[PDB]
């Protein structure tokens, strides 16, 4: 009989930026580099462009990842509605979804939460989130020794303003009450972008500065957060893979 193949679906809620296309070949590659392991089959679907799996094919996937986006997760574009519908279906199937940034926000929306512009304003920087260690099982996604804090790239202007009643907050920060959360055993959401790196961040900063969206001094302060430190990238890959591939007991 056939071996059980491992299949993951990536919902690309962003187009490929010029820098990401040139440097990495696009976000598919970025996501697979971050979360993929040898021998898995990753299908991506450019949901932002209205490309979706068929509902009948959802069962073949072992897990789903929803990417970041420049779009607002509270908007009502047809593709966002369709994304919410398909996420609702996957959620009902109890299939694993890792939501990243926009994805974190979409899952919150589907489960009755509210997303909108953050009360304390946008973040574009390397930040640190405080872990709610009391909500985390030793030897689950976060390893045997749970960190007090994790460094992650932040690139967002919106947040979960109202958490679904079914969500457990796993991390917060001074300005954002919901930096990471889980719902049941199959939904896991991070507001930051574990897939980003210094090069991706700095290129966004440069571009948004050039557009006149932020001041030079803001751009400078954003970049300064990563001049001498990086995100906890290896730890994020471990956590996310632990969750997405059920590599450790559930939390």
From Swiss-Prot:
> Which enzyme class, named as a word?
hydrolase
GO MF, any single term: gamma-glutamyl-peptidase activity
Compartment(s) where it occurs, according to its Swiss-Prot or TrEMBL record: Cytoplasm, Cytosol
Coiled coil residues, start to end = none
Q: In biotechnology, how is it employed? A: Cancer prevention by GLSs is attributed to the formation of isothiocyanates (Scheme 1a) upon hydrolysis.
Q: Known CDD domains for this protein?
A: GATase1_1
UniProt keywords, alphabetically = Cytoplasm, Hydrolase, Protease
Q: Which GO terms describe its cellular component?
A: cytosol; plasma membrane; secretory vesicle
Q: Where is the active site?
A: 101, 193, 195
Can you state which reaction this protein catalyses? an S-[(1E)-1-(hydroxyimino)-omega-(methylsulfanyl)alkyl]-L-glutathione + H2O = an S-[(1E)-1-(hydroxyimino)-omega-(methylsulfanyl)alkyl]-L-cysteinylglycine + L-glutamate; (E)-1-(glutathione-S-yl)-2-(1H-indol-3-yl)acetohydroximate + H2O = (E)-1-(glycyl-L-cystein-S-yl)-2-(1H-indol-3-yl)acetohydroximate + L-glutamate; 2-(glutathion-S-yl)-2-(1H-indol-3-yl)acetonitrile + H2O = 2-(glycyl-L-cystein-S-yl)-2-(1H-indol-3-yl)acetonitrile + L-glutamate; (Z)-1-(glutathione-S-yl)-2-phenylacetohydroximate + H2O = (Z)-1-(glycyl-L-cystein-S-yl)-2-phenylacetohydroximate + L-glutamate
Which Enzyme Commission number(s) are on file for it? 3.4.19.16
Glutamine amidotransferase type-1 domain boundaries: 17-214
Say where the protein is mainly found. Answer: cytoplasm
Q: Name one GO biological process term.
A: proteolysis
* Pfam family, any one: GATase
Q: Which pathway does it serve?
A: Secondary metabolite biosynthesis
Family stated for the protein in its record: Belongs to the peptidase C26 family.
Q: Please describe what this protein does.
A: Involved in glucosinolate biosynthesis. Hydrolyzes the gamma-glutamyl peptide bond of several glutathione (GSH) conjugates to produce Cys-Gly conjugates related to glucosinolates. The gamma-Glu-Cys-Gly-GSH conjugates are the sulfur-donating molecule in glucosinolate biosynthesis. Converts phenylacetohydroximoyl-GSH to benzylglucosinolate. Can use the GSH conjugate of the camalexin intermediate IAN (GS-IAN) as substrate. Required for the biosynthesis of camalexin, a pathogen-inducible phytoalexin with antibacterial and antifungal properties.
| Name the UniProt record assigns to this protein | Gamma-glutamyl peptidase 1
Species assigned in the record: Arabidopsis thaliana (Mouse-ear cress)
């Amino acid at each position: 009989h056939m071996v059980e193949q491992k299949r993951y679906a990536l919902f690309l809620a962003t187009l490929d930026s010029e820098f990401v296309k040139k440097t990495y070949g696009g976000y598919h590659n970025v996501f697979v580099t971050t979360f993929g392991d040898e021998g898995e089959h990753w299908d991506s679907f450019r949901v932002v462009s209205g490309e979706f799996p068929d509902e009948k094919d959802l069962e073949k996937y072992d897990g789903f990842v929803i990417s970041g986006s420049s779009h607002d997760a509270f908007e009502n574009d047809d593709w966002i509605l369709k994304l919410c519908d398909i996420v609702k279906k996957i959620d009902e199937m109890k299939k694993k979804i890792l939501g990243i940034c926009f994805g974190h926000q979409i899952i919150a929306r589907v489960r009755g939460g509210t997303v909108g512009r953050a009360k304390k304003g946008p973040e574009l920087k390397l930040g640190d989130i405080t872990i709610v260690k009391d909500a985390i099982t030793p030897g689950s996604y976060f390893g045997n020794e749970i960190p007090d804090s994790i460094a992650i790239i932040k690139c967002h202007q919106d947040e979960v303003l109202v958490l679904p009643e079914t969500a457990k907050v796993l991390a917060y920060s001074k300005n954002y009450e919901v930096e990471m959360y889980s719902i049941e055993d199959h939904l896991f959401c991070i507001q930051g972008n574990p897939e980003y790196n210094k090069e991706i961040l700095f290129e966004i900063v440069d571009r948004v500065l050039a557009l006149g969206y932020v001041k030079q001094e803001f751009a400078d302060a954003a970049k300064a957060t990563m001049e001498n430190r990086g995100a906890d990238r290896k730890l994020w890959e471990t956590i996310c893979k632990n969750f997405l591939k059920g590599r450790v007991p559930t939390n």
